Amino acid sequence: RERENESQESHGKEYPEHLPLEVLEAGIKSGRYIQGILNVNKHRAQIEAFVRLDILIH
RNA sequence: UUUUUUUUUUUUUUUUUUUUUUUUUUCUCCUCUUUUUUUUUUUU
């Protein structure tokens, strides 16, 4: 009963689609985008992703 | 004492040509464990 709900609440997209650069210059300048290096744990390597300014990416 | 006649190896040579490696499939796919991540230092 779960199965149909998870498979029909997934549609036809797997990852957020990217977008142009002029957006990213502006979003930096206006001050709504930080940017740093990104590393991952290695005991847990599908969950514990870090965004060196640390931002936890789950 | 036994004469005379019954052809034979197809004829021919003095014709133009402006393309080009290959060639045509097989789907989506659960990476298990003390961690933040350690870090100067000196002898190559």
Curated annotation (Swiss-Prot):
Localisation per UniProt entry: Cytoplasm
Family membership noted in the UniProt record: Belongs to the RNR ribonuclease family.
Subunit-structure text: Component of the RNA exosome complex. The catalytically inactive RNA exosome core (Exo-9) complex is believed to associate with catalytic subunits EXOSC10, and DIS3 or DIS3L in cytoplasmic- and nuclear-specific RNA exosome complex forms.
Function: Catalytic component of the RNA exosome complex which has 3'->5' exoribonuclease activity and participates in a multitude of cellular RNA processing and degradation events. In the cytoplasm, the RNA exosome complex is involved in general mRNA turnover and specifically degrades inherently unstable mRNAs containing AU-rich elements (AREs) within their 3' untranslated regions, and in RNA surveillance pathways, preventing translation of aberrant mRNAs. It seems to be involved in degradation of histone mRNA.
Protein name: DIS3-like exonuclease 1
Upper taxonomic lineage: Eukaryota, Metazoa, Chordata, Craniata, Vertebrata
Residues represented out of the complete protein: 211 to 280 of 1054
